[PDB]
Amino acid sequence: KPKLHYFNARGRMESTRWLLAAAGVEFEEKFIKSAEDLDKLRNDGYLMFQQVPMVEIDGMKLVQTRAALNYIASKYNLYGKDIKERALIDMYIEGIADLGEMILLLPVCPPEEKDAKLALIKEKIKNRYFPAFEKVLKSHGQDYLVGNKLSRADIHLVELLYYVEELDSSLISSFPLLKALKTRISNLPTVKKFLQPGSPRKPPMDEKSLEEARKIFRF
Amino acid sequence: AEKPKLHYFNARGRMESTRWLLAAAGVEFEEKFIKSAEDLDKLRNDGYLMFQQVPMVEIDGMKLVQTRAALNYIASKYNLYGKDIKERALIDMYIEGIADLGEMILLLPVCPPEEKDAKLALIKEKIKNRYFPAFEKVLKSHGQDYLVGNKLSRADIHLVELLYYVEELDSSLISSFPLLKALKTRISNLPTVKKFLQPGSPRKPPMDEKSLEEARKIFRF
Numbered sequence A: 001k002p003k004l005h006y007f008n009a010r011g012r013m014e015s016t017r018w019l020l021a022a023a024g025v026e027f028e029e030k031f032i033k034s035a036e037d038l039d040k041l042r043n044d045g046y047l048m049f050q051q052v053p054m055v056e057i058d059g060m061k062l063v064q065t066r067a068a069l070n071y072i073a074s075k076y077n078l079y080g081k082d083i084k085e086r087a088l089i090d091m092y093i094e095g096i097a098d099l100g101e102m103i104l105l106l107p108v109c110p111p112e113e114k115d116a117k118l119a120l121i122k123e124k125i126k127n128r129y130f131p132a133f134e135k136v137l138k139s140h141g142q143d144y145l146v147g148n149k150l151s152r153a154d155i156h157l158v159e160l161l162y163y164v165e166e167l168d169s170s171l172i173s174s175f176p177l178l179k180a181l182k183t184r185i186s187n188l189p190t191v192k193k194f195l196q197p198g199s200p201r202k203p204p205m206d207e208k209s210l211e212e213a214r215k216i217f218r219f
Numbered sequence B: 001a002e003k004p005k006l007h008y009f010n011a012r013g014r015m016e017s018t019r020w021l022l023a024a025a026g027v028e029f030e031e032k033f034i035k036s037a038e039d040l041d042k043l044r045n046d047g048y049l050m051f052q053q054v055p056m057v058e059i060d061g062m063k064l065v066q067t068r069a070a071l072n073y074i075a076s077k078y079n080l081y082g083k084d085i086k087e088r089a090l091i092d093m094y095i096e097g098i099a100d101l102g103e104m105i106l107l108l109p110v111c112p113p114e115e116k117d118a119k120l121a122l123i124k125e126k127i128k129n130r131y132f133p134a135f136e137k138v139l140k141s142h143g144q145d146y147l148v149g150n151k152l153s154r155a156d157i158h159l160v161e162l163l164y165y166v167e168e169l170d171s172s173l174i175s176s177f178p179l180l181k182a183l184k185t186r187i188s189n190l191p192t193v194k195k196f197l198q199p200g201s202p203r204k205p206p207m208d209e210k211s212l213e214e215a216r217k218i219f220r221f
């Protein structure tokens, strides 16, 4: 089983949980609880840049979110059929990571900047990101973003649509193709299982979880 | 068919690593320099930019926005992305650390002036204690001239571009890392990289206040 090293929170590990579960791959997590837990990994030389996420997979200790995502994606045939398809995939999911990063760090945003940061995020969802991905689906009329077959791009976009719904459920309302994609992807047997109660899917970060973050990661 | 065409302002910014990679692969490219917010809006109105931003690289009939999307395509196309998926994973792990450090150094100029000195000091601490030792450890683990697969890869190129920027920041930082210095020298001596480092190539200067002001105006920040 791949083994995911992170704390018990979404943070930078959640896109990897979604991808493994989507690919039908059982994984184990080793939850970090304290700074001491983190220091153990560093001391044991598990972490190339002293940071998590780290995924143990196939005798590698893969730190850096994208390094394990790319490797999981190629291994399980979710990175398209050739390097041109991979280029479209990487362009789509990097815009996804961009929006994703804004939402991810919103909890950590200095309190006097939170209002403006939220407003910006909602503005970009509506005017920049959602229109870009609706354009894609409209262009080809197909069920999947790339190559008319399931890829990473679909899973990462659907994960983002959940986080967008938690922010403001109206934001997707003018984007019918994005809504239909969320439904279709959420009904694929693996994703459906991941979305059910009691899965390893993680909740939004609350105040307690955030305080655990500051103690583990020393910030 | 056609040369790749790089769409960016006339500065390092987020395009310089791609400039580095293409010239290392021995690939001739054209640049189209955005000079104004009006230039950028024409790209947008024209439909050239998926998320209304640059870098954009026109290659092999695609208009690739997102730095990593064109870099990954270029690395794979010219056999600078390892020989298999496990090599690509060591490569990606390495270059993402490079990218995290590169980002810190890139955005340095846009820091509030009362934050600048502590940020500079954090950056230099991370170089000495986090990043340089990690890459020195890699070279020493195998003793080979390249980071991955004993064959030139994009990881050597991105790392050595990054060595050049740390040298501009503080030339002593690298001084306790002999294998990194050796790498810089060997990679700089590859025919293609040597030509790129010579006067008059596409290689871009450090960004001055004048260029940052052009950035503020063009990208509206």
Ligand SMILES: CCCCCCSC[C@H](NC(=O)CC[C@H]([NH3+])C(=O)O)C(=O)NCC(=O)O
Pocket: A011, A012, A050, A051, A052, A053, A063, A064, A065, A066, A104, A105, A107, A108, A205, A213, A217, B096, B100
């Ligand atoms: C809601 C915020 C989520 C929790 C904190 C951020 S993730 C933990 C942090 N890890 C990273 O920043 C890794 C970044 C790296 N670019 C990646 O994508 O893996 C860390 O180990 N920090 C310890 C350190 O840098 O020393």
Ligand SMILES: CCCCCCSC[C@H](NC(=O)CC[C@H]([NH3+])C(=O)O)C(=O)NCC(=O)O
Pocket: A094, A098, B013, B014, B052, B053, B054, B055, B065, B066, B067, B068, B106, B107, B108, B109, B110, B215, B219, B220
């Ligand atoms: C210290 C100053 C450094 C200047 C760097 C700005 S790069 C220009 C900026 N582009 C991006 O942020 C693209 C980010 C994307 N993640 C990528 O890697 O390509 C842009 O088009 N912005 C316009 C927009 O987002 O509307």
